[PDB]
């Protein structure tokens, strides 16, 4: 008799959103792959569910994947990605960077990304390395075999810089964003990037 009045809404286990939020918070790498794939699908198909305004304890959960990508970009001038354990971290970092790119066309998931004083350091870092590519300086010459790792790395950063620039609306004199992009514009041949 007691096994007849079960609530129908919780008899499938946990719901999928708490499943995705707990899967990243653990350390199991395949479950992290699953969680990032589902976050990417929900970010493309219905971004308001993962609006940063609604779920506030979600942006450091992506910072903990995006912030260790700076070491990989530093070491990417040589053939650094040797085993199959650093590459998985690279792909998780690029996928989380795409998720934050996709959430940044909302105008309510954007101010939280702007007020963070550490995503802009990553954007400035990626743009400085792409300026080192675009000028041709001997410091940090790009290794060609990592180039497809870097190329789609720099299309996902400019689309952040295209979205947050309206909130950097006071332009200073000796700015690094403006100097870097005006260095980049002379080099590239992409219609989309221009």
């Amino acid at each position: 008799n007691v096994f007849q009045s079960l609530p129908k809404e919780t008899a499938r286990g946990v719901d999928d959103l708490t499943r995705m939020e707990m899967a990243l918070l653990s350390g199991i790498p395949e479950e992290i792959k699953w969680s990032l794939k589902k976050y990417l699908t929900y970010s493309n198909k219905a971004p308001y569910m993962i609006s940063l305004r609604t779920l506030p304890d979600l942006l450091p959960l992506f910072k903990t994947f995006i912030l260790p990508l700076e070491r990989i970009v530093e070491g990417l001038n040589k053939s650094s990605i040797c085993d199959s354990k650093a590459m998985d971290s690279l792909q998780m970092g690029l996928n989380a960077l795409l998720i934050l790119r996709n959430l940044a066309q909302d105008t309510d998931s954007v101010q939280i990304l702007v007020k963070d004083r550490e995503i802009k350091s990553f954007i400035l870092f990626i743009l400085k390395k792409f300026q080192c590519v675009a000028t041709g300086d001997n410091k940090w010459q790009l290794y060609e075999g990592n180039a497809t790792f870097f190329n789609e790395l720099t299309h996902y950063t400019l689309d952040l810089m295209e979205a947050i620039s309206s909130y950097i609306a006071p332009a200073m004199k000796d700015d690094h964003y403006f100097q870097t992009l005006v260095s980049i514009l002379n080099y590239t041949k992409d219609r989309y990037m221009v």
């Binding site: 809404e9 719901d15 999928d16 699908t41 929900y42 198909k45 219905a46 569910m49």
Partner: protein, 42 residues
């Protein structure tokens, strides 16, 4: 405050190509067959 809500219909297509031009017709059919099913609820 919790609200146990049914999620949105996400178009997970059976075969998954990679080029966009093999997708747009199926996604148009999904948008029609979702918004017509959802319009009567209003």
């Amino acid at each position: 405050p919790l609200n146990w809500v049914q999620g949105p219909a996400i178009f997970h297509m059976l075969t998954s190509p990679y080029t966009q031009d093999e997708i747009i017709n199926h996604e148009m059919n999904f948008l029609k067959g979702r918004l017509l099913e959802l319009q009567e609820i209003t």
